[PDB]
Amino acid sequence: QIAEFKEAFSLFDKDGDGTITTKELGTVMRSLGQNPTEAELQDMINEVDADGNGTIDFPEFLTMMARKMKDTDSEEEIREAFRVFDKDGNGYISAAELRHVMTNLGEKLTDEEVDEMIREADIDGDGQVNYEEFVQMMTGASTAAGSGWRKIKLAVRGAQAK
Ligand SMILES: [Ca+2]
Ligand SMILES: [Ca+2]
Ligand SMILES: [Ca+2]
Ligand SMILES: [Ca+2]
């Protein structure tokens, strides 16, 4: 239940200082195939700042992304992820896209890691992850590589405001 947030933040702050600056969130959102501007950063920060210092605290961020609960379901975030991942939007995610997404954020991953991820997310084993199966990662992926999909999903889920 809380693990989602714990990891969502853990993967966010790499310095592990106990806060997130415009720099972090900036690259985090920009690494998701988006083009965030200074306004977006300053906005979010000032939007998640209870004191007004220009920094993201521990509970602050949690509350910010927590707003997602407001939505009837997490479908929006889900589709949004698989949608932002597929640069071509062909309807499937290739090792390339996923890899770039992990590397961009700065998530050290090995050939085996990504390989297994796609191997688990792809039942047909066509080297492409579809949405239909992509959602299955949350339907009992305990034995699967749900880990990776979770981290990436959390980053792309929190990176946004919706
Ligand atoms: Ca920081
Ligand atoms: Ca603060
Ligand atoms: Ca593709
Ligand atoms: Ca497939």
UniProtKB/Swiss-Prot annotation:
Residues 69-139 are annotated as: Necessary and sufficient for interaction with PCP4. Ca(2+) 3 binds at D86, D88, N90, Y92, E97. Ca(2+) 2 binds at D49, D51, N53, T55, E60. Changing F82L: In LQT14; significantly decreased of KCNN2 calcium-activated potassium channel activity; not changed KCNN2 expression; not changed KCNN2 location at membrane; decreased thermal stability in presence of calcium ions; decreased interaction with RYR2. GO terms for molecular function: adenylate cyclase activator activity; calcium channel inhibitor activity; calcium channel regulator activity; calcium ion binding; calcium-dependent protein binding; protein kinase binding; protein phosphatase activator activity; protein serine/threonine kinase activator activity. Ubiquitination results in a strongly decreased activity. The modification Phosphotyrosine is found at Y92, Y131. The modification N6-acetyllysine is found at K14, K87. GO terms for cellular component: calcium channel complex; calyx of Held; catalytic complex; centrosome; cytoplasm; cytosol; extracellular region; myelin sheath. Ca(2+) 4 binds at D122, D124, D126, Q128, E133. SMART domains: EFh. The modification N6,N6,N6-trimethyllysine is found at K108. There is a cross-link at K14 (Glycyl lysine isopeptide (Lys-Gly) (interchain with G-Cter in ubiquitin)). SUPFAM superfamilies: EF-hand (SSF47473). Residues 1-35, 36-71, 73-108, 109-139 form the EF-hand domain. It is found in: Cytoplasm, Cytoskeleton, Spindle; Cytoplasm, Cytoskeleton, Spindle pole; Cytoplasm, Cytoskeleton, Microtubule organizing center, Centrosome; Cell projection, Cilium, Flagellum. Keywords: Acetylation, Calcium, Cell projection, Cilium, Cytoplasm, Cytoskeleton, Disease variant, Flagellum, Host-virus interaction, Isopeptide bond, Long QT syndrome, Metal-binding, Methylation, Phosphoprotein, Repeat, Ubl conjugation. InterPro entries: CALM/Myosin/TropC-like, EF-hand-dom_pair, EF_Hand_1_Ca_BS, EF_hand_dom. GO terms for biological process: autophagosome membrane docking; calcineurin-mediated signaling; cellular response to interferon-beta; cellular response to type II interferon; detection of calcium ion; G protein-coupled receptor signaling pathway; G2/M transition of mitotic cell cycle; long-term synaptic potentiation. The modification Phosphothreonine is found at T37, T103. The N-terminal and C-terminal lobes of CALM bind to the C-terminus of KCNQ1 in a clamp-like conformation. Binding of CALM C-terminus to KCNQ1 is calcium-independent but is essential for assembly of the structure. Binding of CALM N-terminus to KCNQ1 is calcium-dependent and regulates electrophysiological activity of the channel. The C-lobe interacts with KCNN4 channels in a calcium-independent manner, whereas the N-lobe interacts with the S4-S5 linker of KCNN4 in a calcium-dependent manner playing a role as calcium sensor and gating the channel. This protein has four functional calcium-binding sites. Calmodulin acts as part of a calcium signal transduction pathway by mediating the control of a large number of enzymes, ion channels, aquaporins and other proteins through calcium-binding. Calcium-binding is required for the activation of calmodulin. Among the enzymes to be stimulated by the calmodulin-calcium complex are a number of protein kinases, such as myosin light-chain kinases and calmodulin-dependent protein kinase type II (CaMK2), and phosphatases. Belongs to the calmodulin family. Homotetramer. Interacts with MYO1C, MYO5A and RRAD. Interacts with MYO10. Interacts with CEP97, CCP110, TTN/titin and SRY. Interacts with USP6; the interaction is calcium dependent. Interacts with CDK5RAP2. Interacts with SCN5A. Interacts with RYR1. Interacts with FCHO1. Interacts with MIP in a 1:2 stoichiometry; the interaction with the cytoplasmic domains from two MIP subunits promotes MIP water channel closure. Interacts with ORAI1; this may play a role in the regulation of ORAI1-mediated calcium transport. Interacts with IQCF1. Interacts with SYT7. (Microbial infection) Interacts with Rubella virus protease/methyltransferase p150. This is Calmodulin-1. It comes from Homo sapiens. The gene is CALM1.
